Each structure stands twice: as structure tokens, then as C-alpha cells.
């Protein structure tokens, strides 16, 4: 007809082989078929095809792979970056493994890239800072935005005073919202001062899980259970959705939630 999908797909591949056995017809047909955009079903079918032997549409494969977003594509794209030395595609791969959170070794390959072929700048500093590295580096280079990133490292670092400098920047430039929010959060963490904190949270965001935490933190900073309760339930629900999306990643993260 019983209609069986998997039955078809492999069989469809056998047929695809028979076609592969001008098929310019097949060529364009399947091409546009890919262009159709269920999706991952036939996508994977194609993957199987390739696995037996190449169906081509190389960087097309790469593209549609990205389109899948499923991050298993990161393998296909790996093969892509496996082909040439594209520092761009390289970076893409870096962030890809970041998505994969296999990214430790990939960061190895990143430091390698800066070592092997030339080097990058932005994602370079960003990832090297994701690595324990880049810190004094981002410090000088910014001394030479990215400064907000170095500030994020300062948060990762100690020196809530350095964070107070970043806070001077916050007053200076106040996006400016998002920037200040995470930052001044870090500050209030370091700096027990409730006032700068007040400024912070005030400046934070309509949906602000961290500053929900801060909201309640302030309610607690003096008295009120109530607003704190609000923040509690609400942010609880937010993180609830978050985990609901989901270790193997989130264990630590959700653990942080709990």
C-alpha cells in the first residue's frame, strides 16, 4: 500500500540507484525536491544515498544540512570544512560544535586554526575566551562590545571592582540594556551593594530570568515574600519550559535552575 515509510526510503534508494544506474531528469528533480522544504525524512534518505555513494550537491548538501538545524548535520558540514580551509566555514564549524557542545576538542581545533592557518579575530577571541584563554588577551585587544565580552570574562573572573569599571561603562552607555543587565548582575553578585543592584534590575528586561532571580533577590534584600514569590513561580515556569525543551548538556544547567 500497508504503507511503510522506511520500507520505501531504502527501496526508494534502490530505485535511486537504478536511476543512478542521463538522470538529468533525476538530477534536477531531486534537486528541487531538496529545495522543497518529512523534510528530515527524505533528507536522511539522501544521507543514506550518499553513504552508499555520492549524490553530489555538495555545499547544497551543506546548506540544506544547516537548514535541518538538527546539528547531526554538523557532521556533513564537518566533511565540508574537511574539504577546504575556509576560515569562515571553519568558524561556522566552531560554533557548530558549540551547538554540539562537543566543542572542547573543536576549541582545540580552533587554537589549532589560529596556529595552523592565519587566525580569526572575533569568534577567535570569543571562543578563546570560552577557552580559559583570551582573557588578558581580550583585555589588551579591547584596550587596543568585545569589551563587554572581556567584561563577561571579568565576571568569569573576580574583581567586582573591575566589574565596577564595567559599571562605569554601563552608566556611560545605557543592547545597552542587555549589556548592562548581565554585567550589573555580575556586579551585584560581587558587590553586595543593593543600590547599584537596584539600578541593574531596573535596567534589566521584561523577560529577565536572571533578573527575576534578582527581583526576588531584592524583595528578600529587605522584606517582601510576595514579589519574590511572583518571581519565584514565574521564573520557575520559564526554566520549566527551558528544561521542557531538553545529562549530557542540561544536567549542570537545570541543576543551576533547581
Amino acid at each position: 500500500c500497508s504503507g511503510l515509510a522506511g520500507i520505501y526510503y531504502p527501496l526508494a534508494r534502490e530505485l535511486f540507484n537504478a536511476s543512478f544506474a542521463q538522470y538529468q531528469e533525476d538530477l534536477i528533480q531531486s534537486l528541487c525536491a531538496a529545495l522543497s522544504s518529512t523534510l528530515l525524512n527524505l533528507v536522511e534518505f539522501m544521507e543514506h544515498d550518499d553513504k552508499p555513494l555520492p549524490i553530489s550537491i555538495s555545499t547544497l548538501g551543506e546548506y540544506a544540512q544547516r537548514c535541518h538545524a538538527y546539528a547531526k548535520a554538523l557532521h556533513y558540514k564537518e566533511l565540508e570544512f574537511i574539504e577546504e580551509p575556509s576560515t569562515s566555514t571553519i568558524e561556522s564549524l566552531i560554533t557548530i560544535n558549540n551547538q554540539l557542545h562537543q566543542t572542547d576538542a573543536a576549541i582545540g581545533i580552533l587554537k589549532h586554526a589560529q596556529q595552523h592557518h592565519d587566525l580569526q579575530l572575533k569568534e577567535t577571541w570569543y571562543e578563546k575566551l570560552q577557552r580559559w584563554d583570551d582573557a588578558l588577551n581580550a583585555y589588551n585587544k579591547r584596550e587596543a562590545e568585545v569589551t563587554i565580552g572581556k567584561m563577561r570574562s571579568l565576571h568569569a573572573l573576580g574583581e567586582w571592582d573591575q566589574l565596577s569599571e564595567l559599571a562605569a561603562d554601563k552608566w556611560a552607555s545605557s543592547e545597552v540594556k542587555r549589556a548592562i543587565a548581565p554585567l550589573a548582575a555580575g556586579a551585584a553578585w560581587g558587590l553586595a551593594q543593593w543600590d547599584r543592584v537596584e539600578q541593574y534590575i531596573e535596567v534589566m528586561k521584561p523577560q529577565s530570568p536572571d533578573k527575576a532571580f534578582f527581583d526576588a533577590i531584592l524583595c528578600l534584600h529587605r522584606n517582601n515574600f510576595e514579589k519574590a514569590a511572583e518571581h519565584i513561580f514565574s521564573a520557575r515556569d520559564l526554566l520549566v519550559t527551558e528544561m521542557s525543551a531538553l545529562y549530557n548538556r542540561a544536567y549542570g544547567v537545570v541543576v543551576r535552575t533547581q
Binding site: 544521507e47 574537511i82 562537543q102 576538542a105 587554537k111 586554526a113
Partner: protein, 814 residues
């Protein structure tokens, strides 16, 4: 505090910034533990006598406090106090403790240890400090024995004693067993003891302690137990062998194997002792002893194809004769072949079937016996001729011999349908020990120089346990191998988030069989590197060797290839080639495509652990044959370990030394930039190794490699004894001392072997030396430690370089 203090110790383990930060923070806040904290921050600073100062300061502080809640606070603080004593003790011991100060040092240790009631699993290591005091003492006794220019060394160690000191740390070593080191320091102190001596102090003390400790403790190292066979001084060592059979009696059939093996091998006097222990076995639950005896003996029965073994062996024997005129010497081996002939057509349709040929040959052999025993010539002809014809016939049979079955060979094997204890090396201490469903009489004859026939024997659990013939191989060596590998995997279990990264070496069990023999098994579904590769690459529809191809293409031979010639050659070929096929096998194995990822990490870590393992232990076996991986989601199989020492150092053929072996783009394309982080991960691991147990357990396993005839066999072979062959060659005397000052050499004899074995101890000394270099550490023109970053780096270079590496002949399979 102790909360936030725990946060502080965390900070200590944690990187610098947080370390010093939280340090200062919490320091600012009986902060005796915080004393220890800031102290740790000082170790972070590294000020020697600042440390020592405040250390002794709080020491005397608490001394006054406790004289000689707040009470319990002081109990804990006491533990920490002694702890401190040891901590600073080691801290200075860095600079120190060769001879000298260590005495006092050790005292403090013991002092601290005396104060302990404790963390003293920590002070187990400090009881292992005291034991290492007994070591440095023994080393000082090794210093005295070296400069002595075994009652001599006995009295030497005595009279204080260092043995008196020793027995203390021995009982505390048992106490350490009680603490957890673990099996490592266990066996360590154990052999340390047996070798120490049997004297009255030692005798009584060890009697109590060993008596006071456990069995299953002693259960491990049982191979190393057997490694002691004939105790030169029966003494209390005799009684210790008694203790050996005693512990043995407990769950003997849980192993009992070593018994069987030692029985199989002829230890002579020690084989008589083996018969004694056999009696013990033939005593305790004697039935299982019998069944097992049957099992082992039946294995030994299977063995080689008998007449075939005799045939090939005699082929090499006549090779020996004809070449160089060995003759009678080789014919003495033929006499053993006659002894094999003297066994007659024993088995069923094997030697039985072999009768005719064998009978005829035997007649010819008898005909070869007669006139060669007359003087030479007639039967010197008849021998070579009959052996030639029989060589042809048996050559024909040998091809036909590819098939294997028990009933038509030694049906006695087939005769056993089931036996109580099978567990074919399963050997889980606690277990559901399995009986056997045995297997089909038909077996799989391996194809090799050994042609090491194999099967998988269905058990009571219905799980067929792959077994394999091993012709002239030390599974003991291998036993030790998986053992050290278990020390490894212990550290793995002992590991850090590396253990969250955890990858451990799967240890293929292999049963030893005979003095030269063994029982292997086919691993979990696997792909031999060379095999699998050759398959896929050929199934890639392309020349198996593009290597020998691009080679011969490049020039006539790599044999005469100079460093240059070989360099440019390897270069050009490399250019022509690439290893993406490997990565494409990954891609072939990739199914579900997350397999590509995961298994990439798998093989990555595989490579890592391998690297650590070898770089430690040598034994590269660059053969992609020797190389293997898993048909499962997979891990690398590095098996069949020849020995510690460099095959380079060994060789003879080719100069191959690298800590690892990496098919270039195989390794590379395996993940991203090849082993950038992967080998960096490896660096982390090997660093932990290089830290943790790098002293104690490392040296312990070293000692394992160190010592006697089976092990002395692997290590001899590590040279080999043939590479230990001739020289000037006295040490001083022995050349001119083999002169008319003889024949007493024939009357005395003995060493001989203590000379070679002294050299064994020498090579061992050098080995461990190379371990200390290896561990923590040094190598190359400079040393430092070089620690993680460097020792990893130079490792990586050693991996990177060179054609000199690639100069490995035919075994590199570049």
C-alpha cells in the same frame, strides 16, 4: 566555614584566580583548617620555610592546646596536624630525603602517623611513606649492597634494624590494606616483605598482619604470587607459601588457574612445591581440582597439531643442522622429536592418523638414528631425505590442516560435555561462576606462523567464550599487562572529570597455558587495523599497498634508502597518498551519524589511553596487524604486547621509536585538527598519571615488571637474551676466568644465570629510570619535569617526527 572552607579547598583545586581570590576572602573570613588553607595558598606561593614555619607554629600551638566540641575540634585538628607534618615533610622531601634528613623526616611521618587514628588512608600512603623509608633504607641497603666492597645483607639491614623500621611500616601496610595504594601498595609492600626476609621479627609480624588482613586482598597479584615459586630460603617463606596455599584454599576454583599453569610448567624444585600446592588443591574441594586438572590438561592436549608441530619444528631443526652443521645438536632436538615419536600415535585420528607417515618417518628416523649414531653419513643422508619427503607430505597436510575438529583429533576434548567451573578466565571475584556448554569439536585453526587455532566455548551462561591457541607466548606477561592496565583503569576509576570523560582499557582476558603457550580469545566484535583497512581499501577498489607501490615506484628499495632518500621518498609518496579512507571507514561505521561523532571521540580517547599506555610501557607493536579497533561502536585494540623496552632498542630491524603510532591522516582526519585536543585530553590524562600514583603505583607496577623467571623471561626477551649476546666479554674476570681456573665452573655452575639476571636487574633499573624520566619527568636533551605541556609537546613531536620514525621497516605500514 568548613562549608566555605570546602569552597576554599575547591578554589585550591580550582584555577589560580578563584584560588587566591577565595583564599584571601575566606582568610579574611580555631581556623586551624583555615590555617591549613592559607598554608595551601602558601604551597601555591611555594615559600618553603614560611610553610615550615607556620606549620610547626600551629603544630606547637595545638601541642600546647592539647598538651601531650573544642575537644572534637582538636581531634580533627590533630588529624590535620599530623597531616600537616606529612605535607610539609614531603614538601621538603622534594629537595631532600635521599639518605640523610629523611630519617628525621620519616620520624615526623611516623610521628604524624603515631598521632593519627586518622585520615590515615592518607597516612597509609604515609605508612607507605614509612614503607618508602624502609625503601630508601633498602635503597640505602641497596646502596650498601652495591657498595659491599643472604645473611650478609640480612645482618646489614639488621642491627638497627632497617628491618625493625620496616616491620613497623609492614604492619601499617597491612593497616593500609585495611585503609583502602590499594592492591598496588598491597602487592608492593607484599613482595617487598617476601624479599625483605624471613627473620623472626619479620616472621612474627607478617604472620600476624597477613593473618590479620584478608584473603581476596592477596587474591590479586596471585600471578605475582606465583612469580615467587621456589623460595631460596624456605624459612618462614616456606610457611608463607603455606599461607599462599592457605589463601588459595579460599575460593581456589575462583581462580586455581595459576596453580594449573605452574603445574604445567616445570619449575623443578618449585614444581615440586607446585605439586605440594596441588595436593592442597587436591585436598580442598579435590573434586573441582580434578575436573579442572582435566580441563587444563585437555587444553594442553589440544595444543599444536602434534605431528605437524613435530614436522615444522623438525624442519627448522634440519635447517639448523644443514646450515652451519648443527646436526647432533639439532638432532638432539630431533631426539625430542623422537621423544615426540616416543609418545606414539596417542590421540584419536591425529597422532593416530599420523601413525603411517609418522611410523614410516620413525623407521626412517630410526634408520636416521642408527647410522648417524654410527658416525655420521649414511643416516645423515637418510635423515635429511626422509625429513624432506615427510616435509613435503606434511606440507600438503598442513594446507589441509587448516580445518580443525576435536573428535577427529583429540576427541578426549569432546568427551567433556560439561564441567562445574568453566568461567573461561571470567574470574570475577564475586560472580555467578559459569560451567561450560563447551563447544563444537570443530575449531577454527588460525592462519599464521603460529596458526593459533581458536574457538568460542559455550558456557553455562550460554555465552561462548572465545579462546585461542597461543604457541610460545607469555600470557603471564600479558596477565601482567592487563593487570597494569587495571591499575590504569583503577586510576581511571580514581580519575577526575577525566572520569567524566572516562575511557578505560578493556582488558581481553587470556589464560596462560604452558611454559611457552597460552589461551587467548577473540575479542568483542572488532576490526584488526591492518585487516579491516586492507579490506576496505581493497573494497575501495584500489591497490592494497599503495605504500609498497609508491615505494617501488619511487625507487628500487627503501632498504638502502638514506635518511635523505627515505625522507624524500616518504614525502613524495605521502603527497601522492592520504588517509581519508580511515575517516571514511568511520563514515562507514558512522551509521546513525552520531556514531561518526561519538565513536570519533571513542577512537580519540582510544588513541589517548593507548598513547599513555605505551609511552609508559613501551611495547609499540607498530604493526597495523598489531593494531586493532572494534567492530562495535568501537575502541582501539592494542594487543599482543611484546615488552617494555624499545623495539628500537631491541632492534636489530629498523630504528622505530615513537611514544604513539599514528597513521597520519587516519589519526588526523579522525577528528578535526588531529588529536589537537584529543591528544591534549590525552595530555591531561597522562598528566594525572604523571602525578597520581606516578610515584607509588607506577613504581609498583615497575616492580611488577621487575623480578623473576617468567617476568625475567618477558624482560629477557625484551632485550632479548640474544640481544644480550656477546661482548668482550667478561665483566672483568669471566673471560680469563673461564680458563684453567676451571673446571670448577662445571663443579660450581650456578651463575651463569645470576650474572644475566643481574643484567636483568640492570636493564630493569634503566627501565624504571626511563620511567622516572617518563614520569613527571624527563627525556630529551633538556628535562625539567617538562610536566604536562612540554612532555605532551615533545611527545607530540615524537609523534610528528619523523621519517626516522617512518624508518620503521614494514611494521610502520605508513
Amino acid at each position: 566555614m568548613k562549608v566555605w572552607i570546602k569552597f576554599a579547598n575547591l578554589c585550591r583545586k580550582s584555577g589560580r584566580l578563584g584560588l587566591a581570590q577565595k583564599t584571601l576572602n575566606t582568610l579574611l573570613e580555631a581556623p586551624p583548617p583555615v590555617v591549613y588553607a592559607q598554608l595551601k595558598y602558601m604551597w601555591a606561593t611555594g615559600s618553603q620555610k614560611e610553610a615550615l614555619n607556620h606549620l610547626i607554629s600551629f603544630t606547637s600551638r595545638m601541642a600546647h592546646d592539647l598538651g601531650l566540641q573544642h575537644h572534637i575540634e582538636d581531634y580533627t585538628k590533630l588529624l590535620a596536624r599530623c597531616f600537616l607534618k606529612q605535607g610539609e615533610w614531603r614538601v621538603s622531601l622534594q629537595p631532600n630525603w635521599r639518605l640523610e634528613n629523611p630519617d628525621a623526616i620519616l620520624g615526623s611521618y611516623l610521628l604524624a602517623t603515631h598521632f593519627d587514628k586518622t585520615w590515615y588512608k592518607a597516612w597509609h600512603n604515609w605508612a607507605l611513606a614509612n614503607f618508602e623509608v624502609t625503601s630508601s633504607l633498602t635503597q640505602r641497603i641497596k646502596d650498601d649492597k652495591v657498595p659491599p666492597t643472604l645473611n650478609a645483607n640480612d645482618n646489614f639491614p639488621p642491627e638497627l634494624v632497617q628491618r625493625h623500621v620496616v616491620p613497623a611500616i609492614k604492619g601499617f601496610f597491612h593497616s593500609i590494606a585495611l585503609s583502602q595504594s590499594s592492591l598496588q601498595d598491597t602487592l608492593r609492600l607484599l613482595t617487598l616483605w617476601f624479599k625483605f626476609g624471613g627473620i623472626p621479627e619479620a616472621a612474627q609480624a607478617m604472620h600476624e598482619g597477613f593473618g590479620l588482613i584478608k584473603i581476596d586482598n592477596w587474591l590479586e597479584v596471585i600471578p605475582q604470587l606465583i612469580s615467587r615459586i621456589h623460595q631460596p630460603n624456605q624459612t618462614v617463606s616456606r610457611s608463607l607459601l603455606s599461607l599462599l596455599a592457605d589463601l588459595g584454599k579460599a575460593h581456589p576454583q575462583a581462580l586455581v588457574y595459576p596453580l594449573t599453569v605452574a603445574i604445567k610448567s616445570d619449575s623443578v624444585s618449585r614444581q615440586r612445591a607446585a605439586l605440594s600446592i596441588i595436593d592442597k588443591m587436591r585436598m580442598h574441594s579435590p573434586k573441582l581440582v580434578n575436573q579442572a586438572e582435566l580441563v587444563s590438561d585437555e587444553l594442553i592436549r589440544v595444543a599444536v597439531l602434534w605431528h605437524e608441530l613435530w614436522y615444522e619444528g623438525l624442519e627448522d631443526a634440519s635447517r639448523q643442522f644443514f646450515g652451519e652443521h648443527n646436526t647432533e645438536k639439532m638432532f638432539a632436538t630431533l631426539e625430542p622429536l623422537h621423544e615426540m615419536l616416543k609418545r606414539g600415535p596417542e590421540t584419536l585420528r591425529e597422532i593416530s592418523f599420523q601413525n603411517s607417515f609418522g611410523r614410516d618417518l620413525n623407521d626412517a628416523y630410526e634408520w636416521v638414528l642408527n647410522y648417524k649414531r654410527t658416525k655420521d653419513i649414511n643416516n645423515l643422508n637418510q635423515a635429511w631425505d626422509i625429513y624432506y619427503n615427510v616435509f613435503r607430505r606434511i606440507s600438503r597436510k598442513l594446507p589441509q590442516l587448516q580445518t580443525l575438529d576435536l573428535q577427529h583429533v583429540s576427541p578426549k576434548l569432546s568427551a567433556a560435555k560439561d564441567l562445574e567451573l568453566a568461567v573461561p578466565g571470567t574470574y570475577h571475584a564475586g560472580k555467578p561462576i559459569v560451567r561450560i556448554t563447551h563447544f563444537e569439536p570443530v575449531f577454527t585453526v588460525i592462519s599464521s606462523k603460529q596458526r593459533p587455532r581458536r574457538v568460542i566455548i559455550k558456557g553455562s551462561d550460554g555465552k561462548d567464550y572465545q579462546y585461542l591457541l597461543k604457541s610460545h607466548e607469555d600470557i603471564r606477561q600479558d596477565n601482567l599487562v592487563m593487570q597494569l592496565f587495571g591499575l590504569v583503569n583503577t586510576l581511571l576509576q580514581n580519575d577526575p572529570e577525566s572520569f567524566q570523560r572516562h575511557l578505560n582499557i578493556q582488558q581481553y582476558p587470556a589464560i596462560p597455558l604452558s611454559p611457552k603457550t597460552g589461551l587467548l580469545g577473540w575479542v568483542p566484535n572488532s576490526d584488526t587495523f591492518h585487516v579491516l583497512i586492507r579490506e576496505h581499501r581493497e573494497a575501495s577498489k584500489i591497490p592494497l599497498n599503495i605504500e609498497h607501490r609508491i615505494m617501488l615506484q619511487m625507487a628500487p628499495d627503501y632498504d638502502n634508502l638514506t635518511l635523505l632518500q627515505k625522507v624524500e621518498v616518504f614525502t613524495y609518496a605521502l603527497d601522492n597518498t592520504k588517509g581519508q579512507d580511515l575517516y571514511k571507514v568511520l563514515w562507514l561505521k558512522s551509521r546513525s551519524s552520531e556514531s561518526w561523532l561519538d565513536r570519533r571521540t571513542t577512537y580519540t580517547r582510544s588513541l589517548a589511553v593507548m598513547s599513555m599506555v605505551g609511552y609508559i610501557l613501551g611495547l609499540g607493536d607498530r604493526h597495523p596487524s598489531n593494531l586493532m579497533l572494534d567492530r562495535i561502536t568501537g575502541k582501539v585494540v592494542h594487543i599482543d604486547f611484546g615488552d617494555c623496552f624499545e623495539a628500537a632498542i631491541l632492534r636489530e630491524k629498523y630504528p622505530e621509536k615513537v611514544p604513539f603510532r599514528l597513521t597520519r591522516m587516519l589519526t588526523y582526519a579522525m577528528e578535526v585538527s588531529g588529536i589537537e585536543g584529543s591528544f591534549r585530553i590525552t595530555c591531561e590524562n597522562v598528566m594525572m598519571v604523571l602525578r597520581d600514583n606516578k610515584e607509588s603505583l607506577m613504581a609498583i607496577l615497575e616492580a611488577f615488571a621487575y623480578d623473576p623467571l617468567i617476568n625475567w623471561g618477558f624482560d629477557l626477551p625484551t632485550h632479548a637474551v640474544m640481544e644480550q649476546t656477546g661482548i668482550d666479554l667478561p665483566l672483568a674476570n669471566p673471560s680469563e676466568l673461564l680458563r684453567k681456573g676451571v673446571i670448577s665452573v662445571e663443579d660450581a655452575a650456578k651463575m651463569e644465570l645470576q650474572q644475566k639476571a643481574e643484567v636483568r636487574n640492570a636493564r630493569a633499573t634503566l627501565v624504571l629510570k626511563r620511567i622516572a624520566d617518563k614520569l613527571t619527568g624527563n627525556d630529551f636533551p633538556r628535562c625539567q619535569e617538562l610536566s604536562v605541556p612540554d612532555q605532551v609537546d615533545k611527545l607530540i613531536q615524537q609523534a610528528t617526527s619523523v621519517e626516522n620514525l617512518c624508518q620503521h621497516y614494514i611494521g610502520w605500514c605508513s
